[PDB]
Amino acid sequence: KSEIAHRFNDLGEKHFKGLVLVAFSQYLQQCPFEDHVKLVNEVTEFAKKCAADESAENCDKSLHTLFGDKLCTVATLRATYGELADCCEKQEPERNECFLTHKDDHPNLPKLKPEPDAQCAAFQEDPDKFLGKYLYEVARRHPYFYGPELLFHAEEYKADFTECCPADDKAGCLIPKLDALKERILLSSAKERLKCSSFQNFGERAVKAWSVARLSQKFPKADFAEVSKIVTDLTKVHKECCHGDLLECADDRADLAKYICEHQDSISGKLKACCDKPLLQKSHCIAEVKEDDLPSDLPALAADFAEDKEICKHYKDAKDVFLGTFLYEYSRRHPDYSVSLLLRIAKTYEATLEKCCAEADPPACYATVFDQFTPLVEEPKSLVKKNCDLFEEVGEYDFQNALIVRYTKKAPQVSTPTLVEIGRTLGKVGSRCCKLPESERLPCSENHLALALNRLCVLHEKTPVSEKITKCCTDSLAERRPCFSALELDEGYVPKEFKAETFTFHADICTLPEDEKQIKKQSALAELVKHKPKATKEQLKTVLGNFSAFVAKCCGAEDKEACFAEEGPKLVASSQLALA
Ligand SMILES: CC(C)Cc1ccc([C@H](C)C(=O)O)cc1
Ligand SMILES: CC(C)Cc1ccc([C@H](C)C(=O)O)cc1
Question: Does 102 appear as a known binding residue?
């Protein structure tokens, strides 16, 4: 009878409110925390009233009609959300589409600083207000965040403040936990944003293609019907989360985790650990599980996909199924490839059949189809080897700067804080992936790139500035990284006017932590490239090294400001000469 009641019964009071908190935070990102808790409570109260009397007035309304309605009751809508008010004129699902469109990928809120004893204080005072604040903060900063997974992280967050607040040294145990948690939030948010961007830009078939490749790798011992079934369910789960259908999304998630754990013996040996765990941890561990060992009975593949005389008929008869099988098969045996790579291979396979099967002797034509995969494989392998050598030689910061030069050359219209955030995330991929066993480096690298590039496409959606960026972001999901790789120096670009103040430094910088000092330098670097786009990376490395030296000297000076003031302008002009 009543959807609200149903979700309520299923989910429980705790998680139900949790996800309603997240839903709302993600929808209306600028509302005070208070205004959200009261909305959650109100809706939760209605839910209880429905759970007890499902016939009751309005209980039978859809979830979206009910949330939409509550979000439209919110204080100062037109002033606070001028765009959002128009959404309230509209009924469901129109209304919801409207909220979604008008969600903010870059709200640039205050950085979350963990003040350990001020928050340990608030935590003891009221643990529930404390954790719910964290859900709010995190949800509004990452409005497409995997909702269920946030509740999970919010629990780790509890366990941090639980195991650190009584401990005599607060900061020392707390600050690195919280920093690690933030690393994890950011990565998680980027995996999920890539999921939702794919639904929105490429659709369901593309998301399933991605899932089939990835789960085939993760569960190489599960047979095709089983991979199919999981992917079908998983896709549905992320589709609902991506449309803000969070309650529905959590319930389907629980069911799918129950399912996978019923069947774990025909899915993967690695699940055991995850199945002996409480609900949220189990879902998390399934989500993050490592690839199983490859089975000894993997079938040769030449027979079915290359030598068989009937391939065109099967391909013509059941396209998505045939290809699906191929992809399952090629991916089970290739944990050593990025999902992108597998998807590219699958397209070249499809494209070999369309070609061959319209010809005279198709079997003579498709007999060599495996051999077309070779150049697809070597190109990323090189990328990863070459960029890992560089990284191993010069370390994160230099590697980041190399990437900032690269990106600013390709898209000098993008704003400096974007190119710096990107270049930096891209170099963190070095840190993450290059250290790994060699056969692991390609998938780590390209899987991680897909996240940063998608983060770029997302920003570029809001603030479009380069056609070269639009084309890469919109032509093909599987071709994105290669399309990006291939951009050179935009030569239609007109160097940005020189503004000396931008390269002029002051004593303020000296009191910054290392992370932040780099950011200011790295920003100058982008700006150096904007003004001198034909300067080589080597030339810029030397200029910036000149800049670092000067910042370090003046920071260690008696009179930091006079040092900056005397030396800075000479360095600013002479450095222009170094970038011819
Ligand atoms: C259901 C889904 C797995 C079918 C399917 C199979 C292969 C492909 C690749 C990306 C292609 O476009 O050739 C897409 C979709
Ligand atoms: C291996 C990886 C960590 C280094 C790296 C960083 C960025 C790029 C982009 C796609 C480019 O080359 O344009 C490739 C490789």
Answer: no
